[PDB]
Design a protein around this ligand. Sequence first.
Ligand SMILES: *[C@@H]1O[C@H](CO)[C@@H](O[C@@H]2O[C@H](CO)[C@@H](O[C@@H]3O[C@H](CO[C@H]4O[C@H](CO)[C@@H](O)[C@H](O[C@H]5O[C@H](CO)[C@@H](O)[C@H](O)[C@@H]5O[C@H]5O[C@H](CO)[C@@H](O)[C@H](O)[C@@H]5O)[C@@H]4O)[C@@H](O)[C@H](O)[C@@H]3O)[C@H](O)[C@H]2NC(C)=O)[C@H](O)[C@H]1NC(C)=O
Ligand SMILES: *[C@@H]1O[C@H](CO)[C@@H](O[C@@H]2O[C@H](CO)[C@@H](O)[C@H](O)[C@H]2NC(C)=O)[C@H](O)[C@H]1NC(C)=O
Ligand SMILES: *[C@@H]1O[C@H](CO)[C@@H](O[C@@H]2O[C@H](CO)[C@@H](O)[C@H](O)[C@H]2NC(C)=O)[C@H](O)[C@H]1NC(C)=O
Ligand SMILES: [Ca+2]
Ligand SMILES: [K+]
Ligand code: NA
Ligand SMILES: [Zn+2]
Length: 805
Amino acid sequence: WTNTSGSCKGRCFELQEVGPPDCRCDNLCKSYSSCCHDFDELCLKTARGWECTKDRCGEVRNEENACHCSEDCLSRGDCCTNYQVVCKGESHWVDDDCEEIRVPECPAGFVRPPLIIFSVDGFRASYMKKGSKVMPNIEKLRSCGTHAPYMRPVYPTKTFPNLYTLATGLYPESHGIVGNSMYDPVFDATFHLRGREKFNHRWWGGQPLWITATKQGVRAGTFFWSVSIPHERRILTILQWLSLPDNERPSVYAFYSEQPDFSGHKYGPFGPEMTNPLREIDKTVGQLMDGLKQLKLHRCVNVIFVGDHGMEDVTCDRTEFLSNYLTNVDDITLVPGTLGRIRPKIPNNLKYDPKAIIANLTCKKPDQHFKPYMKQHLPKRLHYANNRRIEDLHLLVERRWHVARKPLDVYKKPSGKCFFQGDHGFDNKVNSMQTVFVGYGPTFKYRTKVPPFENIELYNVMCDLLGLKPAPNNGTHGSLNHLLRTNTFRPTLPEEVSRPNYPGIMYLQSDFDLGCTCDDKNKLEELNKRLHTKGSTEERHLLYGRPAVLYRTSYDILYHTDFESGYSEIFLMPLWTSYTISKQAEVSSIPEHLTNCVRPDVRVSPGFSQNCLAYKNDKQMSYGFLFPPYLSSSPEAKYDAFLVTNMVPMYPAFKRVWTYFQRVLVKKYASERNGVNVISGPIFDYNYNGLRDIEDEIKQYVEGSSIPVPTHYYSIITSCLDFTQPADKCDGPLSVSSFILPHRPDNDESCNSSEDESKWVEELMKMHTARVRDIEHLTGLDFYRKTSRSYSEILTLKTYLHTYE
Ligand SMILES: *[C@@H]1O[C@H](CO)[C@@H](O[C@@H]2O[C@H](CO)[C@@H](O[C@@H]3O[C@H](CO[C@H]4O[C@H](CO)[C@@H](O)[C@H](O[C@H]5O[C@H](CO)[C@@H](O)[C@H](O)[C@@H]5O[C@H]5O[C@H](CO)[C@@H](O)[C@H](O)[C@@H]5O)[C@@H]4O)[C@@H](O)[C@H](O)[C@@H]3O)[C@H](O)[C@H]2NC(C)=O)[C@H](O)[C@H]1NC(C)=O
Ligand SMILES: *[C@@H]1O[C@H](CO)[C@@H](O[C@@H]2O[C@H](CO)[C@@H](O)[C@H](O)[C@H]2NC(C)=O)[C@H](O)[C@H]1NC(C)=O
Ligand SMILES: *[C@@H]1O[C@H](CO)[C@@H](O[C@@H]2O[C@H](CO)[C@@H](O)[C@H](O)[C@H]2NC(C)=O)[C@H](O)[C@H]1NC(C)=O
Ligand SMILES: [Ca+2]
Ligand SMILES: [K+]
Ligand code: NA
Ligand SMILES: [Zn+2]
């Protein structure tokens, strides 16, 4: 219980931690119904508005006013933000020319540049195009400071998961806020935007910036504002805080704006009605900057202007209804809209039949505007599976569409129209969902554009800007060093844990009883005394050094004319297979007599090899090769491609994808990019946590054997950023794209897979694009260790995501 009888006198927006039975006066008390009885009259003053007027200059101080224009206001930090402009002939910050801030210029008493995070809800990246015509203050931050053309949010692209991601550097599956609404089957409770439940700390995991700061003895302003506090008051409060005594003043502040999200929902992202909301946000920014200038802090503070997600054209007319697919939608609960999450309406209902539901939801309309996934089958880049609050059954919705349970849930007006024309929440690589980032201040670079990056990266950077050590998170610390003038983070290469063996030719064909047969032989190669020696293999095919193995295991480096690989004696297959394909490379066939050819590898003991018998006996599982016979450099070299040490288990369904990739796409990449270097390999993620499985976690083997089946196959395709130089002779920055393809028994994901592979395989691969960094997590390997670039540049490269938008 809170004793509301107390008073907020001399306590307004106090940074003091106060709890029951004492009443509060902080910027969140209203949200807790714990404000002292006079909080509003003493703390939310509104008299005379938010701006000084000529007739107010030098006034007698009336403590009833919202903000002051009296002579003493400056030293009290009470002035309306335009005080000096109206009353002292100064210029608005926005009218001042941009000037490089080479070192912080702070009043005495400031030991470090404060950080102010200015978050705008639903600010689509492309809104920035509206330029100084609409947002002159924001355009000055953007053009003069450091900006990205856009920033990638996390899925789902809604506000709660994104704001907490920004605060923690964690994926939603790790921090717990996996949606604006969610049900936790252990709590048996439902979290909603509206309601008290969300205030319960049990929902919020990880360690958000304000906690990290506090634990390390750095003072944080309040990172939450009750909706009833007008933005002008929030700004005045931050400026008031900044004027506090040296020993009370916070180092980090957060402003939040609910716009332009709401206007976007109402009017759509391209409505003429969006201009007004944008003007208002810009005005608020101008208040902050004017205020800062008044305080002599405009060349002292670092400011981050950042959005949580974008906004797409979505209207009532574009709603799919589950009732068109399912017989009883009244027995399920659906988290709806721009994503779908499905569970039984009655928790734990025994009659719930997810296999039958998914079957009815799979490719049943030719223009179907969503796709069902068991969560473990969602593209790995989304990192949306490892949490009990994430339903097993998910619907990825097509941009511009909604999914609903039944037409009852949709409310057309007499106009046949809906009240909303905008929404968001879709796949985070969708263009419309991209949001904004600008950094401005002494620690950021001047007039610099940086490539787009993910919002999970910012937590490390804000820690850097505040001299803090970040809690464990999903950012890659250093990948954003290029945004900063100073306070960069010097990364260190992870230490290799397992050294490879380099087995020579040791066994005889006679030693092998694996059930493998090859109808032909290359007897010439038996005469090559230096067969499979290093030679020039590593320098042609392993361009960026061997991947470091970062866990305890036993593996062999194997050399070949056309490829090199790191063969695991434990998983019975390569951890990685690396090869270079030149722009002019020739594609050839697998000779008919070699169709079913598999050859024992005399470098590796029979006990550490797969056996073809398992494959012959398993009527569902077939096999493929990591280095493709199609790209052999000669008929003689092609024999290497059929070694049992190049073989991996693949469902025929998957082989349709993989063969198209091996035979058609790699060459196409080489042709388009002036040669490519390829590293491919297996991934084991049976418990869908985005991390390499230990042996105990692998749950499927080839029939009758201990050959483990990968849940995915990866490929990393590198070339020279400067496409005029061949991949193998590159002098500068690299260009990379990667994939993590799901290894599945069918192609149900691909509604057109009945057609030729040229009609559907690439579409599938684009959906499963990935960062090299994703693959590192899933494999425990570390790539690009030997290059001519800085470690920081490599880190950036590893976080790159080729989105194909
Ligand atoms: C993204 O980055 C994060 C952070 O580094 C990585 O997540 C970490 O993964 C490691 C390795 O598996 C886990 O280590 C295990 O930790 C457990 C117990 O740890 C407890 O205490 C820690 C530290 O105080 C705390 O962070 C953990 O919090 C989890 O559980 C809370 C209560 O349920 C929950 O509120 C919170 O959201 C978080 O849940 C998430 O993680 C758990 C697994 O712990 C998972 O089941 C859940 O679905 C969420 O994903 C926890 O109380 C030890 O017993 C083990 O021995 C082991 O050391 C870390 O716990 C985990 N940290 C966090 C915050 O998630 C991700 O792997 C990385 N992702 C990728 C793809 O790289
Ligand atoms: C709730 O708050 C009010 C105001 O703080 C408390 O009223 C005071 O009670 C003390 C103790 O009897 C008196 O000496 C003061 O005169 C009261 N203050 C005023 C301004 O009237 C009240 O006691 C609190 N209720 C509790 C403690 O449960
Ligand atoms: C999947 O869709 C089929 C229709 O294609 C549904 O089949 C109906 O089944 C009910 C009994 O469950 C029958 O009375 C109807 O005659 C069937 N419809 C038709 C037109 O064949 C089936 O119910 C759906 N299953 C789920 C899980 O929703
Ligand atoms: Ca795993
Ligand atoms: K088979
Ligand atoms: Na299909
Ligand atoms: Zn919204």
